[PDB]
Curated annotation (Swiss-Prot), chain B:
This is Small ribosomal subunit protein uS9. It comes from Thermus thermophilus (strain ATCC 27634 / DSM 579 / HB8). GO terms for cellular component: cytosolic small ribosomal subunit. Belongs to the universal ribosomal protein uS9 family. It holds the Pfam family Ribosomal_S9. Signal peptide: none annotated. Keywords: Ribonucleoprotein, Ribosomal protein, RNA-binding, rRNA-binding, tRNA-binding.
Curated annotation (Swiss-Prot), chain C:
It comes from Escherichia coli (strain K12). This is Ribosome-associated inhibitor A. Signal peptide: none annotated. Associates mainly with 70S ribosomes. Localized at the surface of the 30S ribosomal subunit, at the interface with the 50S subunit. Binds across the channel in the 30S subunit where tRNAs and mRNA interact during protein biosynthesis. Can also associate with 100S ribosomes, which are inactive dimers of 70S ribosomes. Contacts modifed methylated residues of 16S rRNA (in complex with T.thermophilus ribosome, 2/3 residues are also modified in E.coli). GO terms for cellular component: cytosol; cytosolic small ribosomal subunit. Induction: During stationary phase (at protein level). Also by cold stress, remains ribosome-associated for the 4 hours tested, then disappears when cells are warmed (at protein level).
Swiss-Prot record, chain E:
One of its GO terms (molecular function) is rRNA binding. This is Small ribosomal subunit protein uS19. It comes from Thermus thermophilus (strain ATCC 27634 / DSM 579 / HB8). Belongs to the universal ribosomal protein uS19 family. One of its GO terms (cellular component) is small ribosomal subunit. The gene is rpsS.
Curated annotation (Swiss-Prot), chain G:
Coiled coil: none annotated. GO terms for biological process: translation. This is Small ribosomal subunit protein uS10. It comes from the Bacteria. The gene is rpsJ. It comes from Thermus thermophilus (strain ATCC 27634 / DSM 579 / HB8). Part of the 30S ribosomal subunit. Forms a tight complex with proteins S3 and S14. Also contacts protein S9. GO terms for cellular component: ribonucleoprotein complex; ribosome. The lineage of its organism: Bacteria, Thermotogati, Deinococcota, Deinococci, Thermales.
Length: 60, 127, 97, 23, 83, 206, 97
RNA sequence: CAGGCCUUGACAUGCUAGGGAACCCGGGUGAAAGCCUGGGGUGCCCCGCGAGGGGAGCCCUAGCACAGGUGCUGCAUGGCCGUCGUCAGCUCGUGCCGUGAGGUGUUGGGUUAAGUCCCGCAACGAGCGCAACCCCCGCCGUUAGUUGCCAGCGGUUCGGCCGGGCACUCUAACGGGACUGCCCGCGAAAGCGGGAGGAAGGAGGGGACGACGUCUGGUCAGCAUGGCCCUUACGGCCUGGGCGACACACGUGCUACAAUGCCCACUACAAAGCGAUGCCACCCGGCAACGGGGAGCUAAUCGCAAAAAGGUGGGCCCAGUUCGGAUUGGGGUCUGCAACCCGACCCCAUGAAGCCGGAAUCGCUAGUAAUCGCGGAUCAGCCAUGCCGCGGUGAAUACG
């Protein structure tokens, strides 16, 4: 049960609470950042390829 | 006329202004002994001029920002040691051997992932 | 006390008691068996019986495998005995000047 | 100590306010 | 507990079948999944079946169980001890 | 598994982002999603032209998609027949003024994304994986590179036991930040499963 | 007569603050130099691994750099060649008064 | 998990027809989903003063291909990660030695954090690692001067508030700076010890960075993917329950057992972040959580904001207590459709165990440990005492 779950998260819900975020890239339900709309795994995948504008590896 | 040094320590930045006078010292709109009231470490902030005898010879205008009291205190020590050298270049010797001229680079080490603090490691059962 | 984990596998309370009775061979050496932990598992060729035990003189770690689950259990105890008897007597070797 | 809600230190620990830590 | 500014919550679909029974000479047994509904005084004296996830439990409402929820009286976990 | 992405390790020092534009907190995710939708279609369609990179710019409700490729004509077509065709299927998605440029690749055998793809194609064609890898390295070095290393992992030849196969020539200093190293990945999809192809190309230091 | 510039890369940001300071400077008259506002840092810390391995992370940042310029002595002669402003793609300009 | 439901299906590309496009507000039944419905107007290009005919941009009804599966296999796999280990190792080319596996180099003497460098040598070179190139911090400079700052001058309604200025602090971009470069001494050399200068000294402190490989390591449940298995069901929707159970057992943590302490009142001193159905000043109501007003801020401007330890003053007087704050009764607040299972917070009352912990065992070498608070991601709310960060105060010891 994932594809139906990916579609049911898009569908506006019968109540405002039932809304939750998924990963727009892989459908992952957990650890979804709202800034990117991505999960932690896709966040690191796109950032490593340079396809996140501005996002760079941070060291200090 | 007026003499200035820049003093920094940890996260404190102190700007000190040495004008000749009887000895009065004011830190951020307060008397010295009122700003550091009840702090034992304070007197160390005046040590550079006790080393070049300018203890009562100067008045002190001092601003202070950032960090905490003792960091601000050590910042003063560098600041007024900075000012006395521009006040007189030969004040370096018999002030530099007292270390008062160097800037203390020891600062908070960054917290790292996997640890609880900078180095404190999580407990585990190897058994 | 002694803990038993059946990873990705179901066992009975009888099986767990057999394990406790088999680990009881280690009581021979009269040393504290501290929080002993057995892990029974199933691999494509047979069963794996893991164990980690701490004693006052060191730790015991050993793994036993065999098609028959009880044999893998027994092979584990054999490997654990040889380690315990090494922990209990190795210090006696460097005794003479 | 910190675990006592009815004290100032307890309300600081929880990040809350009330009669024993006003705002 | 729920804010007093808000109302005493009943699922409205359960409240309705209460009054139709009241206004006609009750009672029939009420089956419901409204564990969240409060036991308002109009319910006092009825016997209502509460779904616990498996069974609808017949719960006879009395006078002293009013400021409560229906779930409190059809517990969900079967437990009889250990050993 | 322990190696950092050699491109991501060099963003801002030897490599520039594939999507250059500012955006604010309420906008970033929406543009970014469009950027990946743009790449999702374009990478499927322009595969056969030798798609090595897709730069993307954004200013004010418009976007300037650059395409780096080895066969520019396969993208353009007859006088611009497919190039104009694209800008329509493109602006249908973008919903705005999606200008599309094309730029050729100097040497398609000094571009790691292409070298990896060529090996991945040779693998799906059931070529000697070990030989093919030595070929790619030999082609990149003959094309003048200062170092090259290709990796292929998985059921090579169909074997039940997966295996990794690699070859290298010259210098490939992945710890060196100032070394210009191009990295590309390609997915050989076979009847027995998936293999992964990683090409490293060393174009000199800076 | 205010212009503030925001961008993710500071190399393009500073160049795009020079080609404004330089622009209306000679174009008459006064230009208050590019003042770097403090940078807003937006941090991203994730587990390197797709599954467990909780004690291994990788840090990412997204820095939103800021610049301010005051074209002090306006003169709508300047308010023209600024209408055709060749600024790179990475930066965003605001004009207020 | 239980029950109530749906069968090209919540979703893709299709081909064929009925209606009509599409759509919007409702009616009934039901827990809801569903089932049953009741209304109402499709451009185009079309013969159109005319019934009438399409077609196709889109949905609804029937098919048949197909969808769908977080069903199995990490022992068929890609990807990414953990680990040994930031340990200094792992190899190749040619030559030499050996019937051959293989050796040599890479060993050796010296040196280094280092296969680091020096000298030697049937070896001579090369690669992957080491280091460096990158980030933060520490000193100074240049460019900048607001929303940041205030040295002096003028006002000053008592506020850098205004005038004024960019000095200073700062903020943030670019530079300089440290190289055993200089001196003394040992040394063949590489280096080692000591000295000065210097903000910094011998990698300046921390970061990012992880070789050939290992663990048939981890993940088919993030994703991908071979193969196998399900097809009114192992697919899909709903409502409710469960994931929070509790004779027990282990791992990680929080708060403690008190006087270097606890409580109350007053008063200081940060950093990094976040913030337009957001952050909320200030006023009013409430003991309070909070509520009602309401300014400011697309935010170096307004706000979260008070930092806490500390400092001052007062109480407690060694008691299971003014230590500790578990447990429970009662009364409220707020979010949310909904706090029974199963939320956080406030208030009254209750006030447990615990008097420093057996066998055993963990962390830490300096701004570290210890201790003190602050912020963020996730997020309606929150079960965070977690995690990732930030500064305050600031040790002990290393013979070996
Ligand atoms: Mg299902
Ligand atoms: Mg799927
Ligand atoms: Mg939610
Ligand atoms: Mg989510
Ligand atoms: Mg700073
Ligand atoms: Mg004093
Ligand atoms: Mg700290
Ligand atoms: Mg662990
Ligand atoms: Mg057990
Ligand atoms: Mg035996
Ligand atoms: Mg404490
Ligand atoms: Mg108390
Ligand atoms: Mg942990
Ligand atoms: Mg594996
Ligand atoms: Mg794997
Ligand atoms: Mg497994
Ligand atoms: Mg395995
Ligand atoms: Mg021989
Ligand atoms: Mg050999
Ligand atoms: Mg050889
Ligand atoms: Mg070797
Ligand atoms: Mg060897
Ligand atoms: Mg040696
Ligand atoms: Mg080393
Ligand atoms: Mg040699
Ligand atoms: Mg080397
Ligand atoms: Mg200046
Ligand atoms: Mg030395
Ligand atoms: Mg390195
Ligand atoms: Mg999968
Ligand atoms: Mg599979
Ligand atoms: Mg087959
Ligand atoms: Mg549901
Ligand atoms: Mg539940
Ligand atoms: Mg759980
Ligand atoms: Mg037990
Ligand atoms: Mg805890
Ligand atoms: Mg503690
Ligand atoms: Mg006592
Ligand atoms: Mg008592
Ligand atoms: Mg007692
Ligand atoms: Mg008490
Ligand atoms: Mg209560
Ligand atoms: Mg609840
Ligand atoms: Mg204590
Ligand atoms: Mg002991
Ligand atoms: Mg150490
Ligand atoms: Mg906190
Ligand atoms: Mg929340
Ligand atoms: Zn994802």
């Amino acid at each position: 049960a994932r594809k139906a779950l990916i579609e049911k998260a898009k569908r506006t819900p019968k109540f405002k609470v039932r809304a939750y975020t998924r990963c727009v890239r892989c459908g992952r339900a957990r650890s979804v950042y709202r800034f990117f709309g991505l999960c932690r795994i896709c966040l690191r995948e796109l950032a490593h390829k340079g396809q996140l504008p501005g996002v760079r590896k941070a060291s200090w | 006329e007026q003499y200035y040094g820049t003093g920094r320590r940890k996260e404190a930045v102190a700007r000190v202004f040495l004008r000749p006078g009887n000895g009065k010292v004011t830190v951020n709109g307060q008397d010295f002994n009122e700003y550091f009231q009840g702090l034992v470490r304070a007197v160390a902030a005046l040590e550079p001029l006790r080393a070049v005898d300018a203890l009562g010879h100067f008045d002190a205008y001092i601003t202070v920002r950032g960090g905490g009291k003792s960091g601000q205190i050590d910042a003063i020590k560098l600041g007024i040691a900075r000012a006395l050298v521009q006040y007189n270049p030969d004040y370096r010797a018999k002030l530099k051997p007292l270390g008062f001229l160097t800037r203390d680079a020891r600062v908070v080490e960054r917290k790292k992932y996997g640890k609880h603090k900078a180095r404190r490691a999580p407990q585990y059962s190897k058994r | 006390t002694m803990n038993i984990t059946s990873k990705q596998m179901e066992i009975t309370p009888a099986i767990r008691q057999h394990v406790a009775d088999r680990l009881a061979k280690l009581e021979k050496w009269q040393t504290h068996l501290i929080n002993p932990h057995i892990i029974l598992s199933k691999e494509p060729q047979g069963f794996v019986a893991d164990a980690t035990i701490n004693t006052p003189n060191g730790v015991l770690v050993a793994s036993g495998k065999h098609e028959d689950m009880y044999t893998a259990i027994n092979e584990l105890i054999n490997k654990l005995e040889r380690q315990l008897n090494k922990l209990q007597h190795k210090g006696e070797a460097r005794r003479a000047a | 100590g910190k675990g006592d809600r009815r004290t100032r230190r307890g309300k600081i620990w929880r990040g809350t306010y009330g009669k024993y830590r006003p705002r | 507990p729920r804010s007093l500014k808000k109302g005493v919550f009943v699922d409205d679909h359960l409240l309705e079948k209460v009054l139709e029974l009241n206004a006609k000479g009750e009672k029939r047994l009420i089956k419901t999944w409204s564990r969240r509904s409060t036991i308002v005084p109009e319910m006092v004296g009825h016997t209502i079946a509460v779904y616990n996830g498996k069974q609808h439990v017949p719960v006879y409402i009395t006078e002293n169980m009013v400021g409560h929820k229906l779930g409190e009286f059809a517990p969900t976990r079967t437990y009889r001890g250990h050993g | 598994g322990n190696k950092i992405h050699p491109i991501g390790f060099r963003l801002g020092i030897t490599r520039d982002w594939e999507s250059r534009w500012y955006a604010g907190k309420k906008q970033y995710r929406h543009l970014l999603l469009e950027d990946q939708r743009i790449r999702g279609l374009l990478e499927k369609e322009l595969y056969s032209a030798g798609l090595a990179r897709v730069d993307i710019e954004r200013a004010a409700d418009n976007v300037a998609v650059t395409v780096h490729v080895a066969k520019p004509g396969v993208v353009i077509g007859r006088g611009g027949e497919r190039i104009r065709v694209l800008r329509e299927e493109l602006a249908k998605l973008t919903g705005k003024n999606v200008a599309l440029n094309v730029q050729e690749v100097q040497n398609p055998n000094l571009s790691a994304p292409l070298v990896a793809q060529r090996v991945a194609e040779q693998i799906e064609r059931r070529f000697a994986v070990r030989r093919a890898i030595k070929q790619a390295v030999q082609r990149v070095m003959e094309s003048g590179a200062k170092g090259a290393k290709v990796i292929v992992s998985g059921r090579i030849g169909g074997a039940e036991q997966a295996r990794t196969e690699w070859a290298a020539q010259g210098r490939v200093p992945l710890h060196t930040l100032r070394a210009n190293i191009d990295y590309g990945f390609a997915l050989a999809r076979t009847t027995y499963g998936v293999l992964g192809v990683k090409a490293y190309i060393f174009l000199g230091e800076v | 007569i205010r212009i503030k510039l925001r961008g993710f890369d500071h190399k393009t940001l500073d160049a795009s603050a020079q080609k404004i300071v330089e622009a209306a400077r000679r174009s008459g008259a006064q230009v208050s130099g590019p003042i770097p506002l403090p940078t807003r840092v937006r941090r991203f810390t994730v587990i390197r691994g797709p599954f467990k391995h909780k004690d291994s992370r990788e840090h990412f940042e997204l820095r939103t750099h800021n610049r301010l310029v005051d074209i002090i002595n306006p003169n709508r002669k300047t308010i023209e060649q600024l209408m055709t402003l060749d600024l790179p793609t990475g930066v965003e300009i605001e004009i207020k008064t």
